[PDB]
Amino acid sequence: NFSVKPGSLVAVLGSTLMNLIPRLGHISAVPQETVLFSGTIKENLKWGREDATDDEIVEAAKIAQIHDFIISLPEGYDSRVERGGRNFSGGQKQRLSIARALVKKPKVLILDDCTSSVDPITEKRILDGLKRYTKGCTTFIITQKIPTALLADKILVLHEGKVAGFGTHKELLEHCKPYREIYESQFG
Numbered sequence: 001n002f003s004v005k006p007g008s009l010v011a012v013l014g015s016t017l018m019n020l021i022p023r024l025g026h027i028s029a030v031p032q033e034t035v036l037f038s039g040t041i042k043e044n045l046k047w048g049r050e051d052a053t054d055d056e057i058v059e060a061a062k063i064a065q066i067h068d069f070i071i072s073l074p075e076g077y078d079s080r081v082e083r084g085g086r087n088f089s090g091g092q093k094q095r096l097s098i099a100r101a102l103v104k105k106p107k108v109l110i111l112d113d114c115t116s117s118v119d120p121i122t123e124k125r126i127l128d129g130l131k132r133y134t135k136g137c138t139t140f141i142i143t144q145k146i147p148t149a150l151l152a153d154k155i156l157v158l159h160e161g162k163v164a165g166f167g168t169h170k171e172l173l174e175h176c177k178p179y180r181e182i183y184e185s186q187f188g
Helices: 041-045 054-063 067-072 090-103 120-133 169-175 177-186
Strands: 009-013 027-030 108-112 138-142 154-158 163-167
Touching (some): 009 120, 041 090, 054 067, 090 108, 090 120, 154 169, 163 177, 169 177
Parallel strands (some): 009 154, 027 108
16 A cells, blocks of 8 residues: 555655655755855765775666766866866756766665756666666655656655645546646646
8 A cells, every 4th residue: 555666766746755754864965056166077976985996887877868978078077076076968968867876776765856957868778777777675756847757756745835646637626636636737
């Protein structure tokens, strides 16, 4: 019922979420606004996981859809990051932050509305990658978009905020009024 299959993707509609997760540490959350520091790309991606290998960092950056971009830079993973990562675009910053979280190998990953600068095609590729290559991790994506929510295995809907619903899209239509209203607000 109110349990999640380990390694699945859960969309969250509606720090209120932190409470329910154990009842639903090794928890990695990616803020909407990133923390990047002066140094190299590799140093940034390894921050908080000292024992990550170069290939583990690549694998993470590939799932985050930022590896091809990193490789394209003249120094690759040893390329310069300016303070705050101001030499990168918003979407590039967000993907580097996701890559860093994946490097940490969390058991629970929380993507806190941190794909807002990432185009929908790239976003879908990131989520498909999480599902395909990041087993060992249960991922929660806090989102505002029904289409994003439909990509997840299950959907958690918060309202008051307490849990207003949980389950598939079909299940939520059948017993979650807040979800019905969100769905209608995005589709006729």
